[PDB]
Design a protein around this motif. Structure first.
Motif, short mmCIF file in Angstrom:
data_model
loop_
_atom_site.label_atom_id
_atom_site.label_comp_id
_atom_site.label_asym_id
_atom_site.label_seq_id
_atom_site.Cartn_x
_atom_site.Cartn_y
_atom_site.Cartn_z
N UNK A 1 44.26 35.28 34.13
CA UNK A 1 43.71 34.57 32.98
C UNK A 1 44.75 33.69 32.32
N UNK B 1 38.06 39.50 28.05
CA UNK B 1 38.24 38.29 27.26
C UNK B 1 37.61 38.50 25.89
N UNK C 1 29.86 29.60 33.12
CA UNK C 1 30.51 29.54 34.42
C UNK C 1 30.98 28.14 34.80
N UNK D 1 34.30 29.30 36.65
CA UNK D 1 34.71 30.64 36.18
C UNK D 1 33.88 31.71 36.90
N UNK E 1 32.60 35.71 37.62
CA UNK E 1 32.42 37.05 37.08
C UNK E 1 32.86 38.08 38.12
N UNK E 2 33.81 38.93 37.75
CA UNK E 2 34.39 39.89 38.67
C UNK E 2 33.79 41.28 38.50
N UNK F 1 33.83 40.14 32.04
CA UNK F 1 35.04 39.34 32.13
C UNK F 1 34.87 38.23 33.16
N UNK F 2 35.28 37.02 32.78
CA UNK F 2 35.19 35.85 33.64
C UNK F 2 36.58 35.26 33.83
N UNK F 3 36.91 34.93 35.08
CA UNK F 3 38.22 34.39 35.43
C UNK F 3 38.08 32.98 35.96
#
Lengths: 68, 248, 180, 262, 248, 105, 48, 50
Positions: free
Chosen positions: B21, B61, B178, F46, F48-49, F66-68
């Motif tokens: 991150x 997050x 996203x 991004x 999602x894991x 959580x998004x990376x």
């Protein structure tokens, strides 16, 4: 299990969503050095208890060889 | 063996995810209208029978940094930046509307107003802005009003054609989707235009990532990562020594 | 001495829980409001301030707490284990259980309502107040109680723990069982 | 734990607090009216081991009188109230004290706070307040709206200039509080201090008599931190930190040899 | 490790300080600009054992604007003016609220109303210059008069007014040399420009910026070195922790 | 490879593209009728894991949601067609357009 | 006046003492191990 | 050998560890409460300014 008595480490992070009115976020009072010392002591004490169990095992086996 | 091996592994795994991150933050320092991502760890305890000794930690997050980005004066007419808080409402490729802070606008061959990401810019009627094809001078207003000069018209025939839809909701009620667009956490929440948002035309808003803030967080994730991987080895060491209780 | 606004900040967590364990504070300001849980265990505090508000649970295990004044609002539970409380005031709005184990408690408010469990284990209390209502489990083990009032209500289990009960309530509806 | 492990850990903990103390001083290298803090180290309790009890003297040099200490700790973060330099500014509301003396501000909770920082200003009502959180400055000094200039004298006598009237009207007088032990003050942040039992009862008076300092207008007091001292302190603290780590590693390796060879 | 975060606050404090210095130097030619200085204060202290005090670092609490009158610039334009004293020109914002400014570069709009030379906001009270006027004269008390051919004596088209504030530093800058009254700014005190503490209107005159360019360059020296000093503590703590988890 | 390695690498490529754009402008600092270019950056998607598969949204402020990110990229090198200054020369065969217009060859 | 006296600990002197204490400690541990090794061997005398 | 001296609220001259420092009279040194300038002599003499 007992918790530490040390005050939490306050850090000024005003823009964080968990910030108070003054802007400080609080983090755990974990002390790295004592955990590393505890890690060493716990491992050393664990292994020396194995020797005592091994030492008592041999004494019982010899005590059984008596009578044979 | 001992469960402290996986208890430390579940901590080292999250430190790498937190590192990812922060890596995305530093890769986006030059990006336009980028809101920095915050990284935090949540302590979750395994409740049940026995002594309360095992507590897992997961990285999550908690929010984003909504502070004003760096403004780049470029002298370009179609460059807009939001003064203070506020958003620009745009619709993505699919069509779902969302908020953006990238004001690197452009005009296509048909007059439709898009941004650098290709998202269409919403207008006064909650529809994409479509300006007349033969333009002569685009002059965006401070409040978002777009005043254009038709081609071949005298300089005194300056008229407004649209007003960019600027929305200023509560920042804590927004989540990044996203594709980098901020939307309401509550579904089907209308985006209502605000009359307080101002657009400084001729400037571009950069990223708000604090480079040193990420670097000083990196050097602490590494140390925490290295402490946990030592715990994995010392738990392995303890089990190997205790293997001598079945020798007989 | 006494806790100040700046000293209060140094004993608060992220979600707003005040931790005063082993801290040398004697009295809290009146009209005190806590965002979350409150912990005054092992403290020399002998009195809680009037208008005290706790957004979580009050923890005073093995403390010197003796007096709680009426009007205190506690959202969570009250844990006064091992403290020096001798009486429970009337009108306390308690959102949870009341644990009074190993305390010099002697008197209880009449028609007291406990929204959780109640403990009077090893307490010198001589008799329970009339019209007592308990929504959880009642532990009276090791106490001096030997006679129950005419009417009482326990919605869980009743644990005698060793004490001998001779006069049972005339009007009693029990949702659980009775254990010696 | 073998006692050598914990004795070395005390040194690591002591130096850790020293680094945190040094780090705060370098952080406040530009804070106006800041006083540097230093960490003080002292040895811990010394214990007689080869004696059942603390037999006084009686062959201290012999193996019977062997005494082993318990390590070290930081005993106090002592405030060094050395007078800083002067910052000549063009602002008309920032003021400086030359010598001993503190400004007194009114805290929201009722008691008065004492500050050495002089960055003051006015609020909507014209009262002289601090330029930070906005706390009023004792005594209350209200500036009339007809004033076109502000003059703060060498003893806090504040005067204003009114058009159409010669000679400057006096609108009040400042006071500075002095303490017998400046190091006993309790810092509460915001460049503020509070009086404790170790400090003493406040001693008020006119700024310029009774041994007090003098008010200087359009000036500020720079922090008295010595950046070179902190860097030299960092070098020593880092080396002591690494040395005690070797002892902990040495003890662990010795303990590893015992249950492995035997 | 609190040492890293203590220095991080020191790094963040200097970064904000340098931002104010750069803004001071950037507006070294802006007419009617008031320089600002950063205000530093130390964070709250903590008692670990209980009487050992450990600080949390430092922060910038405010940016105090020094409203000291700048030097005078002599111009030949008859519409730009300067307040020689305490006072603010009042302009009418598009929102309908009255904004306050110290920049005096004014002009006329299409209908003759006195407006600002930038965004074009009207100046309150409205002064309308007739098309028959050959010259414009502004008195020391705001009396605006015009010389009309064929008529002896200048006729007065209006009178400008200014507003004084108890605490000009309490105003909220909104850009464009404009201020918005706030709670701590005070109560807007209107009146004749030149009586009761109000300054005098100086026609064909401008108020230069009051920034001290020498001071800002020196302020950059101390800010840069202290910023680099805080980085050294972070590096040293990084090596201290890297040594321990490698040694043990 | 490790995700943290490639995320930073994409940032390096984006800056390398930015550098090549800057050097192009400085090389053409004397060209007649040359319009400068600027590299435009945007983030990458991004992921999602902690949701099963690619499921998204819901609780984005929890470990479950959580998004990376995937880094950054240069999406377009935009030509800034700002009118340039005029050079007065004595050659009678060179010409200029003031305002919008392009010569045709 | 105006100065503070520090400690006179010679860091090198302590470190070289440490390494000698470790080696002498380990050599005596080997003496303990060879003492029980001899004792175990001298136990078949009564093992008729 | 710890010469890190300090003055408490009552005026007694102590060191960093709180041990009272003795003087010529073999009694702990007490200074007048409202001092203005404390200078320690090279031979140990304590001169103060009211």
């Amino acid at each position: 299990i007992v918790e530490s008595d040390k005050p939490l480490s306050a850090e000024y992070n005003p823009d964080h969503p968990l910030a108070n009115e003054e802007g400080y976020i609080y983090k755990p009072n974990v002390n790295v050095m004592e955990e590393m010392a505890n890690m060493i002591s716990a491992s050393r004490a664990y292994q020396t208890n194995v020797q005592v169990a091994d030492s008592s095992k041999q004494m019982l086996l010899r005590t059984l060889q008596m009578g044979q | 063996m001992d469960r402290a091996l996986f208890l430390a592994m579940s901590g080292a795994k999250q430190n790498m995810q937190a590192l990812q991150l922060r890596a995305n933050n530093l890769a986006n320092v030059s990006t336009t209208g980028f809101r920095a991502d915050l990284a935090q760890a949540r302590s979750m305890q395994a409740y049940g029978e026995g002594h309360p000794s095992r507590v897992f930690s997961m990285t999550e997050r908690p929010g984003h940094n909504f502070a004003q980005g760096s403004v780049i004066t470029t002298g370009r007419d179609l460059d807009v930046t939001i003064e203070g808080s506020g958003w620009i409402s745009v619709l993505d490729h699919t069509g779902k509307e969302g908020l953006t802070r990238n004001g690197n606008l452009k005009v296509d061959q048909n007059g439709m107003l898009t941004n650098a990401s290709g998202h269409l810019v919403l207008g006064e009627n909650d529809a994409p802005i479509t300006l007349p094809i033969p333009l002569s001078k685009i002059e965006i207003g401070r409040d978002g009003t777009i005043s254009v000069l038709p081609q071949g018209a005298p300089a005194e025939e300056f008229q407004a054609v649209d007003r960019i839809k600027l929305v200023k909701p509560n920042d804590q009620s927004l989540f990044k989707d996203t594709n980098g667009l901020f939307r309401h956490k509550t579904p089907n929440q209308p985006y209502e235009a605000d009359a307080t948002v101002s657009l400084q035309t001729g400037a571009i808003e950069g990223s708000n990532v604090n480079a040193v803030g990420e670097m000083t967080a990196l050097i602490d994730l590494q140390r925490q990562f290295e402490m946990q991987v030592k715990m994995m080895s010392t738990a392995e060491e303890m089990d190997k020594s205790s293997d001598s209780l079945l020798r007989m | 001495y006494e806790l100040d606004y700046y000293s209060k900040f140094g004993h608060t967590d992220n979600y707003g829980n005040l931790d005063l364990r082993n801290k040398p504070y004697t009295q809290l300001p009146s009209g005190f409001v806590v965002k979350g849980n409150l912990n005054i265990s092992q403290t020399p505090i002998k009195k809680l301030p009037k208008g005290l508000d706790v957004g979580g649970s009050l923890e005073a295990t093995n403390s010197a707490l003796k007096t709680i004044r009426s009007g205190t609002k506690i959202k969570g539970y009250a844990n006064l284990l091992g403290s020096k409380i001798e009486s429970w005031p009337r009108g306390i709005k308690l959102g949870g259980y009341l644990n009074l184990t190993d305390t010099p408690l002697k008197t209880l408010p009449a028609k007291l309502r406990v929204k959780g469990d109640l403990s009077v284990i090893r307490t010198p209390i001589s008799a329970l107040p009339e019209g007592l209502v308990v929504d959880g489990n009642l532990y009276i083990g090791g106490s001096a109680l030997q006679v129950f009032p005419d009417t009482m209500t326990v919605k869980g289990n009743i644990f005698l723990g060793g004490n001998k009960i001779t006069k049972w309530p005339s009007n009693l509806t029990l949702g659980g069982a009775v254990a010696p | 734990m073998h006692p050598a492990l914990w004795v070395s850990k005390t040194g690591l903990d002591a130096q850790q607090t020293n680094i945190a103390t040094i780090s705060n001083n370098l952080a406040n290298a530009s804070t106006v009216g800041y006083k540097k803090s230093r960490a003080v180290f002292e040895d811990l309790f010394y214990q007689n081991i080869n004696q059942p009890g603390g037999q006084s003297s009686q062959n201290t040099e012999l193996p019977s009188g062997l005494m082993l200490g318990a390590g070290s700790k930081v005993v106090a973060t002592q405030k060094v109230h050395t007078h800083g330099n002067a910052q000549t500014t063009t602002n008309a509301l920032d003021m400086m004290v030359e010598g001993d003396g503190f400004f007194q501000v009114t805290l929201p909770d009722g008691n008065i706070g004492y500050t050495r920082n002089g960055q003051f200003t006015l609020n909507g009502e014209g009262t002289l307040v601090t330029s930070g959180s906005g706390y009023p400055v004792e005594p209350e000094i209200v500036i009339p709206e007809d004033a076109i200039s502000i003059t703060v004298g060498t003893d806090g006598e504040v005067s204003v200039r009114v058009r159409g009237q010669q000679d400057n009207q006096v609108v009040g007088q400042l006071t500075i509080t002095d303490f017998v032990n400046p190091g006993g003050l309790e810092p509460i942040g915001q460049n503020l201090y509070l009086p404790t039992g170790a400090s003493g009862d406040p001693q008020e008076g006119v700024p310029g008599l009774d041994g007090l300092g003098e008010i200087r207008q359009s000036m500020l007091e720079a922090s008295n931190v010595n950046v070179t001292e902190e860097l030299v302190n960092m070098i020593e603290a880092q080396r002591v930190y690494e040395m005690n780590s070797k002892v902990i590693s040495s003890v662990d390796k010795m303990m590893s040899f015992v249950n492995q060879q035997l």
